Amino acid sequence: TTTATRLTGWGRTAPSVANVLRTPDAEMIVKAVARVAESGGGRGAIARGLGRSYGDNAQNGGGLVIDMTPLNTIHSIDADTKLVDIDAGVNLDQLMKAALPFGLWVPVLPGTRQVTVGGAIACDIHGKNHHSAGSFGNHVRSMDLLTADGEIRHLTPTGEDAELFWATVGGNGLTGIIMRATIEMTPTSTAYFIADGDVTASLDETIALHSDGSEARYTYSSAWFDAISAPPKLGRAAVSRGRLATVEQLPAKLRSEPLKFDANKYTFGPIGELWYRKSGTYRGKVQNLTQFYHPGFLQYQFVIPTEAVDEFKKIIGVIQASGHYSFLNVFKLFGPRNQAPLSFPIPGWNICVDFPIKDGLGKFVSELDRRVLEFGGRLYTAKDSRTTAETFHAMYPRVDEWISVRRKVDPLRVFASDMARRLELL
Ligand SMILES: Cc1cc2nc3c(=O)[nH]c(=O)nc-3n(C[C@H](O)[C@H](O)[C@H](O)COP(=O)(O)OP(=O)(O)OC[C@H]3O[C@@H](n4cnc5c(N)ncnc54)[C@H](O)[C@@H]3O)c2cc1C
Ligand SMILES: CCOC(=O)NC(=O)c1cc(F)sc1NC(=O)c1nc2ccccc2s1
């Protein structure tokens, strides 16, 4: 029934051997969880999606890992209610394609589409539209949760079991296995975006641009920022902002299938500064999803609360002066948070940086953790593999509330992961 497999997260880092159960049969999954519960709990079980977490949240050294990707039935889509009913192994690319002919858009897309619905709920994922749509869990109308006792619980965001619903959102698999969910989609009349592009010369400008009001005009917003240059070039950004196009905004060619989804010597001088400015400045460009959104290393992502703007500028300065060079860097302003205790996003300045593994890096990121903590921010568990229990607990002050929900639903510690043990969420 199960195979011994060396599993890792996407950062190809911290390997651990587990029994991997890979079955299309939901029955077998129920029986395997019963097999784990009866056998004195042991080192437990965790669900796995497409393995796109950089962390260790989808591995369980010496325990059971349940591969959820063969549970990938789309049960129903309804254009009138905007509801899709899917198995938790359905991925967001598959969902996106199935839903478009109904005029329905996946309401939160992350930077990849190769992500399961289960993983999208359990990490409470966010994307380019967070300030207008919130995160994934805001759009879940119901889910079916396989709990430790072997019962499948039907959960909704309001009414009884709300607490457990909200513990499962961002719960990293630790309340049990999400089998099935109903999601409310966003109505759209096209597969396209109308996009504006802006380019700033400085961090001060980047911040000014993001707090001048203009963010209200766009449903989707994010930036690539410079993390290497000295100040005041540092934190200069290519900003890309837009919204879903309506049919009347498309060039005539596209109106018949509006829902179809099918170095050099100059580059470091003044001319390329102009090139990159021109090329990155535009208004009302029509773009598909690939052009607008989806075109060794240690990923590190954090958010600093909105008011702590001076503290945010200080952390960027520390990154640049550190001697650790990050080329691919995403900046976004998050909007309001939801009610999930372990949900990562909070209103404020979100950054994802990417460091090549060098001497000293492990210790440098520890200092960064400390600064993020002091400034009221937190790290994202989907990107993290190395932070301590202490640091994590102080960054998520609702963790105790969460833990008691978890102990209520899982008394025998039937659901467990490397991360759980490391972060003392067990
Ligand atoms: C290139 C790239 C870009 C990314 N961009 C973004 C982004 O823009 N925004 C963002 O928020 N995230 C982003 N991520 C992270 C990714 O969205 C999350 O890590 C997502 O959770 C991965 O889903 P997955 O199905 O691979 O789940 P896995 O990585 O396999 O599992 C992740 C967690 O979900 C739990 N889980 C999975 N399935 C189930 C289930 N059926 N029931 C209960 N728990 C389950 C696992 O136990 C584990 O805790 C990115 C990742 C990559 C590689
Ligand atoms: C590749 C898609 O890029 C985007 O447009 N991203 C966003 O808009 C966007 C907005 C946010 F709030 S968080 C985010 N993206 C991320 O967190 C990514 N992390 C990686 C790591 C490796 C490769 C690609 C990515 S994208």
Numbering used by the authors: 7 to 268, 284 to 316, 331 to 461
Give the published text.
KGaAThe thiophene ring is located in a hydrophobic pocket formed by Gly133, Lys367, Phe369 and Asn385 and accepts a H‐bond from His132 Nϵ2 (3.2 Å). Replacement of thiophene with other heterocycles or adding bulky substitutions resulted in reduced activity against Mtb (data not shown). Only a fluoro substituent on the thiophene afforded an analog (TCA481) that is 5‐fold more potent than TCA1 based on MIC. To better understand the basis of the activity increase, we solved the crystal structure of DprE1 in complex with TCA481. The structure reveals that the fluoro group forms a H‐bond with Asn385 Nδ2 (3.4 Å). The fluorine is accommodated in the pocket with stronger hydrophobic interactions with residues Phe369, His132, and Lys367 than TCA1.
Mtb Decaprenylphosphoryl‐β‐d‐ribofuranose 2‐oxidase (DprE1) is a flavin adenine dinucleotide (FAD)‐dependent enzyme, which together with decaprenylphosphoryl‐d‐2‐ketoerythropentose reductase (DprE2), converts decaprenylphosphoryl‐beta‐d‐ribose (DPR) to decaprenylphosphoryl‐beta‐d‐arabinofuranose (DPA), an essential cell wall component. Multiple covalent and non‐covalent4 DprE1 inhibitors have been identified and showed in vitro and in vivo activities against Mtb, further validating DprE1 as an attractive anti‐tuberculosis (TB) drug target. When analyzing toxicity profiles, we noticed that many TCA1 analogs show inhibition of CYP2C9, one of six major cytochrome P450 enzymes which determine the clearance of 75 % of marketed drugs. Here we report the X‐ray crystal structures of WT DprE1, a TCA1‐resistant DprE1 mutant, and CYP2C9 in complex with TCA1 analogs.
